[PDB]
Amino acid sequence: VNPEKLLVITVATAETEGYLRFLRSAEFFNYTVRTLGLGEEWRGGDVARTVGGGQKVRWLKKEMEKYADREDMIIMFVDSYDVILAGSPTELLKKFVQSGSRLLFSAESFCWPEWGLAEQYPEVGTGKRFLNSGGFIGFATTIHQIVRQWKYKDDDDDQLFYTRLYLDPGLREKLSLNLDHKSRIFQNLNGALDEVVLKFDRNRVRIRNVAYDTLPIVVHGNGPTKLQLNYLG
């Protein structure tokens, strides 16, 4: 795929140190970023809370209306305060084509926020079983068909919304939704610190996942792992 057809969309209500860390990594690798929400009031829930972020989906829904018909375009959505990018657009798109997915979500060890949904997920052996909405990549048309279904409160949970759609077998089959079970593109660090090591790559520090033997592009220092991102770059 042509990197000119990839857009990275993120949300930031302020230019925090985390957002600037994200943005520097994106610019170093020559990604094109679209940032939603700068200077707006965050309504996604008190940052202490372990659920929320629906405002992100509402803003993404509005932006995706521009791309509803762009069959050529690939969009990666990521959190920005606790994410860094560690490889090139060419590497990312090669791995995306290899996934065979039209919308690939990051995966994690914990079924959150509704533990009772865990039984509805396919069992996948040693891979990461559950959906995490801090990063996903897919065709713009497919993403629009997902986010246009958002009709909830700004402090409702984004992850629960995407989870319930992913868990609908008919929809998952029709739209070709998938999870990145072996952290080939997305590395969620919460629940996987025992799996990762630092690796020098052209005088940059990135992550190798030694459990799956992968070199993820997107590193998400979610939950209490946020400070681990300061070793990368």
Ligand X SMILES: O=c1ccn([C@@H]2O[C@H](COP(=O)(O)OP(=O)(O)O)[C@@H](O)[C@H]2O)c(=O)[nH]1
Binding-site residue numbers for Mn(2+) are 79, 82, 220
Q: Partners of 209 in the beta sheet?
A: 196, 214
Q: Taking a C-beta distance cutoff of 8 angstroms, is the pair 188, 107 a contact?
A: yes
42 or 186: CB nearest ligand X: 42
- Of the pair 8, 11, the CB lying nearest ligand X is at 11
Binding partner of 56, given Mg ion, ligand X, Mn ion, none, CB within 5-8 angstroms per partner class = ligand X
The smaller minimum CB distance to Mg ion, of residues 88 and 228, is found at 228
DSSP 8-state assignment for residue 73 = -
Q: Which residues bind Mn ion (CB under 5 A)?
A: 79, 82, 134, 222
Minimum separation from the CB atom of position 2 to ligand X (A): 27
Based on CB atoms, which residue is closest to ligand X, 141 or 219? 219
Could you tell me the two tokens for 4?
Answer: 């000119």
Q: Are 42 and 100 in contact (CB under 8 A)?
A: no
Query: Interaction with Mg ion in 146-185: which residues (CB under 5 A)?
Result: 159
Cβ burial 203-227 (10 Å sphere, 16+ → b, else e): eeebbbbeebebbbbbbbbbeebbe
Q: How far is the CB of 190 from ligand X (least distance, A)?
A: 8
- By beta-carbon proximity to ligand X, the closer residue of 134 and 216 is 134
Contacts with ligand X, residue ranges (CB under 6 A)? 10-13, 37, 42, 44, 47, 53, 56, 79-82, 134, 222
Binding site members for UDP: 11-13, 79-81, 223-226
Q: Shortest Cβ distance from residue 54 to ligand X (Å)?
A: 10
Q: Which residues contact 127 (CB under 8 A, 6 or more apart)?
A: 107, 181, 182, 212
Relative orientation angle of helices 54-64 and 158-166, to the nearest 10 degrees: 60
Helical segments of 29-71, H only: 54-64
CA distance 197 to 183: 13
Binding residues: 11-13, 79-82, 220, 223-226
- If one asks whether residue 132 binds Mg ion (CB under 5 A), the answer comes out as no
Interacting partner of 13 out of Mn ion, Mg ion, ligand X, none (Cβ under 5 to 8 A depending on kind): ligand X
Query: Which residues of this protein are in contact with Mg ion, per CB under 5 A?
Result: 159
